[PDB]
Symmetry: C2
Subunit: 149 residues, 2 copies
Amino acid sequence: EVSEYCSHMIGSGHLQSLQRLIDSQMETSSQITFEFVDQEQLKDPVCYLKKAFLLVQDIMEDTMRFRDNTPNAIAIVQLQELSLRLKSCFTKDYEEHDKACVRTFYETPLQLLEKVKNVFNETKNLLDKDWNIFSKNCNNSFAECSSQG
Amino acid sequence: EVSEYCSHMIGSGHLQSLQRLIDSQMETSSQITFEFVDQEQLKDPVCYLKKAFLLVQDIMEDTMRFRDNTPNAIAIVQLQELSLRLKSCFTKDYEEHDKACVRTFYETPLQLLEKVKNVFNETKNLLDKDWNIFSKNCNNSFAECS
């Protein structure tokens, strides 16, 4: 079940952690490649975040990497712990729609980090309005995407 | 004027702060371009650091940029202040030789930060050995560079 366990689960400390993450990065024009949800393909706000929340998990595990026991590595662990708690708040969608709406991006680390912060921030905002919002069936939204990863 | 006060300017807090900078950088394939001293051209330890000390000031001003008032931006300002004090410890070498021993690098921000930390670390170490050491005339060392 999705349940009231979902409401208020993403806290302000989580967002401040994301912000300190962003603020400590040296500013660079250097771009990196990553997979993320293509907003131009998936425009519905709820299903965008349903898909994006899942990808953020891969992004944290493989891309947002820091030295053991540094403040930023600790924030990632907390965001991963938080994401595990959040997994019962997103209803599962069809497995045929796993790579739909995903594309490779060529963007700076700061732009990737802003995408991740926006996912956690907007997920928190919608959960605070309705703890059941991510029980939405997004199979038709994913089917309307033009491409796949 | 070079003086005994040189051996007291770079503190442990400056290095620990540099380490905290390094520890906060995300491990990523993102590489950046910068100008720095070539260790292969300038192998003499003292003249390497005379050259590297000047270049680190451009790197801090133009490349190691952080959003204003963040912990890392403040650390950079403090390292810049510290460098301003250290300039009394380095005698001038011929202007002749400004871009000598310098080449472009394409390395990660972590690698650049390690290069900067090593300059401050080795400078502190040598000043602790002879606070007059960077009065050395490095004009001939700079001349053998490519």
